[PDB]
């Protein structure tokens, strides 16, 4: 439990290379990097005129992107704490999501691009080095909820228009498919591989590549490690919406859902594949968390114990445990093998808005309406 934020915390993320570094965003228009070894602040990121809504590390660990209510995006250096230039303008409403291009589809010695979605129904591709809007993906007729840069050169966006759109980065922003199965606001979106996409060339030990060539190697190595289970690369996608349901996809392979996984009694606000894509877990406003099979999408078990709406879930690296935050101020980490609660955590005094597992599975962070960051260590 460490202070240092003047407003309610809205987001957080651990470093893809170490469990000692964590960035976070609040409504005090600032962001902060932390030392998880000493539980103390490190840097303060300033230059935003409004709430910092979402933060996203770079899969190489060199750059920190940040999205805000002020319709702009800022890139930062995690060690120095300096803004790497002027803001990234061209959005007319607030930023909803950030998605980085994975290292394996990125040339060695070169830096990965950045994708951002907004309430303006568009998604802009930025050049992090040259600082410019390379592409502007538009076509959604309502707010875009979430965007994910797939490890196969495709970007998937979900929106309030009950539609999930697929974008091709190898065709310079061309839209190749438009998925229409949902019947309400698509709230979130998770890929079977976005753990590998997030950590790029790093691993569970934190071993860094010695040369940009090695980074190009391990990036494709870690990605093929997971997306291949039959002999060829296959990445899956789950969507969550306000129609109480979810859909499993193999979008490139087929424009039609693999399964319609149903059973939640209220809207599904968050969904997350396992780090190995084996399980699927969904958090909903009916105070429940349901567990599904990552391969075919069959219902497995229900996680019970929350008294209020569940806001978000985060997977541990060992694919056995997972942590959740809810409106009822508490954090709970569940065990997939016992299909029930592992240990209950001393939670906050108010609503908890964000959680995260460290990549090595050592520490767990959280923050919310009481303006206080909390760190838990397994």
């Amino acid at each position: 439990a460490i202070a240092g934020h003047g407003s309610t915390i809205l987001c957080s993320a651990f470093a893809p290379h170490t469990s000692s570094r964590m960035v976070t965003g609040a409504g005090d228009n600032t962001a902060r990097i932390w030392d998880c070894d000493t539980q103390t602040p490190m840097h303060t990121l300033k230059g935003h005129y409004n709430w910092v809504l979402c933060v996203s590390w770079s899969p190489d660990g060199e750059v920190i992107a940040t999205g805000s209510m002020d319709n702009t995006i800022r890139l930062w250096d995690p060690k120095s704490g300096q803004c790497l230039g002027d803001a990234l303008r061209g959005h007319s409403k607030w930023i909803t999501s950030l998605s980085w291009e994975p290292i394996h589809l990125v040339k060695p010695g070169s830096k990965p691009r950045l994708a951002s979605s907004s309430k303006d129904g568009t998604i802009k591709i930025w050049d992090t080095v040259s600082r410019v809007c390379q592409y502007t993906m538009s076509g959604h007729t309502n707010s875009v909820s979430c965007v994910k840069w797939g490890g196969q050169g495709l970007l998937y966006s979900g929106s309030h228009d009950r539609t999930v759109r697929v974008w091709d980065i190898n065709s310079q922003g061309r839209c190749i498919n438009i998925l229409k199965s949902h019947a309400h606001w698509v709230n979130h979106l998770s890929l079977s591989t976005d753990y590998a996409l997030r950590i790029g060339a790093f691993d569970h030990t934190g071993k860094k590549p010695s040369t940009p060539e090695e980074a190009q190697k391990k990036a494709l190595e870690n990605y093929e490690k997971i997306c291949k289970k039959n002999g060829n690369s296959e990445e899956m996608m789950v969507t969550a919406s306000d129609d109480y349901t979810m859909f499993l996809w193999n979008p490139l392979k087929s424009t039609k859902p693999i399964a319609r996984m149903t059973g939640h009694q209220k809207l599904v606000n968050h969904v997350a594949f396992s780090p190995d894509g084996r399980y699927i877990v969904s958090a909903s406003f009916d105070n429940s968390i349901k567990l599904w099979d990552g391969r075919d999408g069959k219902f497995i078990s229900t996680f019970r114990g929350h008294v209020a709406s569940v806001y978000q879930v985060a997977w541990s690296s060992d694919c056995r445990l997972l942590v959740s935050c809810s409106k009822d101020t508490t954090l709970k980490v569940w065990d997939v093998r016992t299909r029930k609660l592992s240990v209950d955590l001393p939670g906050h005094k108010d609503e908890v808005y964000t959680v995260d597992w460290s990549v090595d599975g050592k520490r767990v962070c959280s923050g919310g309406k009481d303006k206080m960051v909390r760190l838990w260590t397994h």
Partner: peptide, 12 residues
């Protein structure tokens, strides 16, 4: 108020 991304455009 300062609500998160998913709680914007949501009411009590």
């Amino acid at each position: 108020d300062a609500l998160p991304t998913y709680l914007l455009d949501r009411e009590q």
